[PDB]
Structures are given as C-alpha cells and as structure tokens.
Design a protein around this ligand. Structure first.
Ligand SMILES: CC(=O)N[C@@H]1[C@@H](O[C@@H]2O[C@H](CO)[C@H](O)[C@H](O[C@]3(C(=O)O)C[C@H](O)[C@@H](NC(C)=O)[C@H]([C@H](O)[C@H](O)CO)O3)[C@H]2O)[C@H](O)[C@@H](CO)O[C@H]1O
Ligand SMILES: *[C@@H]1O[C@H](CO)[C@@H](O[C@@H]2O[C@H](CO)[C@@H](O)[C@H](O)[C@H]2NC(C)=O)[C@H](O)[C@H]1NC(C)=O
Ligand SMILES: *[C@@H]1O[C@H](CO)[C@@H](O[C@@H]2O[C@H](CO)[C@@H](O)[C@H](O)[C@H]2NC(C)=O)[C@H](O)[C@H]1NC(C)=O
Ligand SMILES: *[C@@H]1O[C@H](CO)[C@@H](O)[C@H](O)[C@H]1NC(C)=O
Ligand SMILES: *[C@@H]1O[C@H](CO)[C@@H](O)[C@H](O)[C@H]1NC(C)=O
Ligand SMILES: *[C@@H]1O[C@H](CO)[C@@H](O)[C@H](O)[C@H]1NC(C)=O
Lengths: 160, 321
C-alpha cells in the first residue's frame, strides 16, 4: 500500500495467525510457527478504537429536523424551511460519508505503516546475523533456534 | 533457518470504501449505520402518544362530535395526526393562525380541559339550537362540543358581556368563533340584530370581528362558514367578550402544561403496543449505532440521521489471500 508492506514487498497475509494483526513466522530445526506481536497489534488496536470513538463523537452535535406546517399562502417560507432542512441534511450526510472515506484510507495505511515499522525494527535488529530476503523474511547464516527466535521477539536480541 | 514478518488474514468478506479504491475487502470492519425500525408507533419511555386517528388538531380541540374519543386526553409523549384527517371542522370554515397553534402544541405534553363558562349560564340566549346537519351525532344535528353556537331568544339577542379571570397557574388556551351567515335574512333568523360584532379583550388582545356575508358553495351541506380564534390567557389576566350576535362562545378551555418537548408527527400508523427510546413516523428504533437513515423527523434519544445507504468504517487491514 502507501508504505509498501501489506500487499507489497510482502505479497500476502497469513491465513493462519488468528492471534492478531501483525506477527512472526519462524523456521528452524526444532520447527516452524506463527506468533502475533502483542506490542504493535495492541498499540494499533488502541489507536483504531479511538478513531471510531472520535468519529462518532465529532458527529453527535449535528443537525436535527423539526416538523412545521404552513398554509396555502406560505409557500415561500415553507420552501425556505424545506430548503434549509434538506440543506443541513445534505451537508451533514456529506460530512459522514467523506469523513468515513478519508479515515478509512488512513486506517489501511496505518496498518501498512505498522507492518513496515515492525519489519524495520527487526531488519535493523538482526543486523548482520541474517540475510534480508526481500519477501518479509530473514534467513540467518549460522543456525538459530527457539531460544534464539524468542530473542528477536523478546526485543532483547544480541549478546550486547 | 529464518524469521518472517507478517500480517493477519482471514475469510472476512467485509468491504469498505476509500477515495482511491472502492470495495476493498478487509479483515475487520465496523458498521455504524442503523437501517431498521420496528414499523410501529410506540410509547416513548413508558408514555403513550396521542394518536388522533381520523381527527385533526382542530376536530380535537373544538370538540367535533365524531371525535369524542379525545374529549379529555391524558399526558402524551408525542402526537400523531394523519395527513388528511377526515374529521376537523365539521361545520365548514377557517381556523386563524392554525399552524401557529399546532406549533404551540410542540412546547407541551398536556392540555387539560376545563369549563370556564357553563353552558347553563346563558339565561338570555338560546344555547340549545346551535346544531347543524354538518355536525352529525347519533343521527341528529350536533355541534363542536367545546363551544356553543348561541341563538336569539324570544326574538332578541341582548348584548352579551362575559368576563373570565385566569385563576389557574397554567396558561389558558381559549377558543371561540364567529358565524358568517349566508344572507341578511339568515342573520336575522338566527340573531335578530342586523349589524353585529364579537369583541374580545385581554391585556394583550384587542379585537372586533364583524360577520362577513357571502354566497358560497356547500361543504358538508352548508353554505355558511365559521371563523375560529384563539388566544393564550396568562395566569391572572382576564378576557372580555362582548357581542350582540353571531358569537360562538367558549365553554371549555385548556390549561397548558408545559412539560414541553413534543412536536407533531405525520403518519397513518395506529398504536403498536410497544415501548421505545427512539421514534420515527415509520417505526421505532432500538440501536447503538451512531447513525441511521430511517427518517429525518425523529423524537427521543436517537442516532444521527443521514441519507447514506451504506456506512462502514475499516477497523482491521486489507484482507489478502
Ligand atoms: C326546513 C328545511 O329543512 N329547510 C330547507 C332548506 O335547508 C336549510 O337551508 C338553510 C340555508 O338556507 C340551512 O342550510 C339549513 O341547515 C341548517 C344546518 O346547519 O343543518 C339547519 C340548522 O337547524 C341551522 N342551525 C341553526 C343554529 O339555526 C343551520 C344554520 O341556521 C345555518 O347553517 C346558518 O348558516 O342551518 C337547512 O336545513 C333547503 O335549502 C330548501 C331547498 O331544498 O328547502 C327547505 O325546506
Ligand atoms: C527474553 O530474553 C531472554 C534472555 O534473557 C530469553 O532467553 C532466556 O534464556 C535464559 C538462559 O540463559 C533462560 O533461563 C530464560 O528462561 C530465558 N528467558 C528469560 C530471561 O526468562 C527469552 O527467550 C526472551 N523471552 C522470554 C521467553 O522471556
Ligand atoms: C383576576 O383576579 C385577581 C384576584 O383573584 C386580580 O388580582 C388580585 O387583585 C387584588 C386587588 O383586586 C390584589 O390585591 C392582588 O394582589 C391580586 N392578586 C394577584 C394574584 O396578583 C386580578 O387583577 C384579576 N385579573 C384582572 C386583570 O382582572
Ligand atoms: C471463516 O472461515 C473459517 C475457516 O477457516 C470457518 O471455520 C468459519 O466458520 C468462517 N466464518 C464464516 C464465514 O462464517
Ligand atoms: C461494490 O461491491 C458491491 C457488492 O455488494 C456491489 O453491489 C457494488 O456495485 C460494487 N461497487 C463497485 C465499485 O462496482
Ligand atoms: C434493545 O435491544 C436489547 C437487546 O435485546 C434489549 O435488551 C433492549 O431492551 C431493547 N430496547 C428496547 C427499547 O426494546
């Protein structure tokens, strides 16, 4: 997308990571598996939730119609009334649709951005111990296992 | 040996829209547009509405005989009136500032009926013959129940002088009228005096009405017409009526209870024996959605109305196989 990750340098999503939005898929002698990344997936969940709330709250102080009647010789003020009620309705309807649209676009980019940064926090982490495959994966040189994998995820990788 | 960075994916079929691309399939999405109602006119928070059915606000307030169902209506939440009630002014005529009175109804939740002038008080006038075939009741000629069509007595219409002080705490909605006969001959057959008037005075009201005669086509069989007036009498103010003929005096009036917060609804529905927090002319709404597209004229705790057909916010990310 806008950041290149989702549906990009990383061709597809993992149909098997029910755990969260973003995560890992390690592979070594011991075995392979998916595991979501709590820190980011959650920080995202928090961020998106608020947006929903903000959108809802920004739209709660909008217009409201009130019924009035007019006689046969009050057609101008009656039309004036109708013009006005349709006007605010169209104005607020426009606001709800456009806001939803603009923000939805940003939501998809927020996730993409979220993935590129998670991916980066790992690229710049494995430094010279693994090789960047350019498919969203990192293949080390000298064997690494589960106690080692859980290092990268632990954010406490490198004997440094 | 390797570690791969990635993102969630599922069988989600959900679709959102964006400025550049429509129908993006996404893992998770939240709808925020409520599109259903229950098709009924319910009680609003335990309070039942005033459903006028075939009677208009006028038929109700003036006491059209076909509307005895609303002779003494209780506290209401909102009011529903059909588009063209068939029972309004049984005796043809007009109702001054009728729309302003209806709008007034919207600042109130109760009109309590009270007798400010007994029908027996007319010792010098005929308060018994003011009935017309245009106002049928029990197969006989009747008339609006809340007012009285006074008629000359013993071939005399002695000048009337009545005063009523609002000793109530509430504002008083007082309705009266004048009769516009078909011709000079009818004028005398009914009231005896040829040149008449109905003068009304309060602290704010100054008014003299003269019957305007003309020849008009028959409505509900009558070529005559009636003009109805209304004024709000403040507590402690007084109202003075003086007339030498054609006066449609008030009998009942209404104490305005401003629990205020109603407004008139237009619908052909009847009462649906249900309760709701949010009501529209088409039915009620029980929703947690921030928006709805049912109808603009709503009442109670409702979601915000918009013309949208669809309104879905992306929550998850793009769903890619
Ligand atoms: C005896 C008879 O029935 N008269 C026939 C004529 O009908 C009368 O025509 C007059 C108008 O000239 C009125 O419309 C009469 O209708 C009433 C009504 O409202 O129903 C009769 C009521 O009793 C009367 N009420 C009062 C308080 O007087 C009412 C009022 O007078 C008028 O509305 C005043 O505006 O009128 C109606 O019965 C008929 O036109 C004629 C030809 O067919 O034949 C007459 O025999
Ligand atoms: C977090 O970092 C630790 C390293 O401190 C990872 O591995 C630890 O390895 C030691 C052996 O030296 C074990 O005794 C610990 O049980 C491991 N974790 C710790 C410190 O509790 C660890 O895999 C990383 N993530 C976890 C699982 O905490
Ligand atoms: C309506 O009647 C009331 C009395 O019931 C009038 O007001 C009172 O008038 C007396 C003197 O006549 C004063 O001493 C009182 O202070 C008044 N009472 C109140 C409630 O203020 C009132 O004037 C009458 N209305 C009119 C305009 O005729
Ligand atoms: C979603 O897909 C899974 C199969 O992976 C299935 O078990 C689940 O019932 C599906 N949900 C739907 C579409 O109801
Ligand atoms: C989007 O998909 C829906 C599927 O229900 C369809 O009705 C609509 O026409 C599509 N819009 C576009 C962009 O063609
Ligand atoms: C709305 O639906 C919820 C869910 O069943 C229910 O508990 C609540 O009482 C409903 N409200 C009304 C007004 O029916």
């Amino acid at each position: 997308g806008l950041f290149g990750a989702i549906a990009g340098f990383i061709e597809g999503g993992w149909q098997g990571m029910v755990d969260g939005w973003y995560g890992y898929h390690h592979s070594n002698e011991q075995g392979s598996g998916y595991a979501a990344d709590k820190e980011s997936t959650q920080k995202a969940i928090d961020g998106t939730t608020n947006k929903v709330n903000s959108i809802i709250d920004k739209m709660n102080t909008q217009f409201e119609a009130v019924g009035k009647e007019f006689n046969n010789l009050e057609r101008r003020i009656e039309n004036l009334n109708k013009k006005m009620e349709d006007g605010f309705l169209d104005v607020w309807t426009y606001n709800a649709e456009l806001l939803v649209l603009m923000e939805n676009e940003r939501t998809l980019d927020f996730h993409d951005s979220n993935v590129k940064n998670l991916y980066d926090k790992v690229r710049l982490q494995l430094r010279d111990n693994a090789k960047e495959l350019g498919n969203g994966c990192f293949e080390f040189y000298h064997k690494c296992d589960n106690e080692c994998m859980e290092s990268v995820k632990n954010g406490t990788y490198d004997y440094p | 040996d390797q570690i791969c960075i990635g993102y969630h994916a599922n069988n989600s079929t959900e679709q959102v829209d964006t400025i550049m691309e429509k129908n993006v399939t996404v893992t998770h999405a939240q709808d925020i547009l409520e599109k259903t109602h229950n098709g009924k006119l319910c009680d609003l928070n335990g309070v039942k509405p005033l459903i006028l059915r075939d009677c208009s606000v006028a038929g109700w307030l003036l006491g059209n005989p076909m509307c005895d169902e609303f002779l003494n209506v209780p506290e209401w939440s909102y009011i529903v009136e059909k588009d063209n009630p068939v029972n309004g002014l049984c005796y043809p005529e007009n109702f001054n500032d009728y729309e302003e009175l209806k709008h007034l109804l919207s600042s109130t939740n109760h009109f309590e009926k009270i007798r400010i002038i007994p029908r027996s008080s007319w010792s010098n006038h005929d308060a018994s013959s003011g009935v017309s075939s245009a106002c049928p009741y029990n197969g006989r000629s009747s008339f609006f129940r809340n007012v009285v069509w006074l008629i000359k007595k013993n071939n005399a219409y002695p000048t009337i002088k009545r005063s009523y002080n609002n000793t109530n705490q509430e504002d008083l909605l007082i309705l009266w009228g004048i009769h516009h006969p078909n011709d000079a001959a009818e004028q005398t057959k009914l009231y005896q005096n040829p040149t008449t008037y109905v003068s009304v005075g309060t602290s704010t009201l100054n008014q003299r009405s003269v019957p305007e005669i003309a020849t008009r086509p028959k409505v509900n069989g009558q070529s005559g017409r009636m003009e109805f007036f209304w004024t709000i009498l403040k507590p402690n103010d007084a109202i003075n009526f003086e007339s030498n003929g054609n006066f449609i005096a008030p009998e009942y009036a209404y104490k305005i209870v401003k629990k205020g917060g109603s407004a008139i609804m237009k619908s052909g529905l009847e009462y649906g024996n249900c309760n709701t927090k949010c009501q529209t002319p088409m039915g009620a709404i029980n929703s947690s959605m921030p928006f709805h597209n049912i109808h603009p004229l709503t009442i109670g705790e409702c979601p915000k109305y918009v013309k949208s057909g669809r309104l879905v916010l992306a929550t998850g990310l793009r769903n890619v196989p």
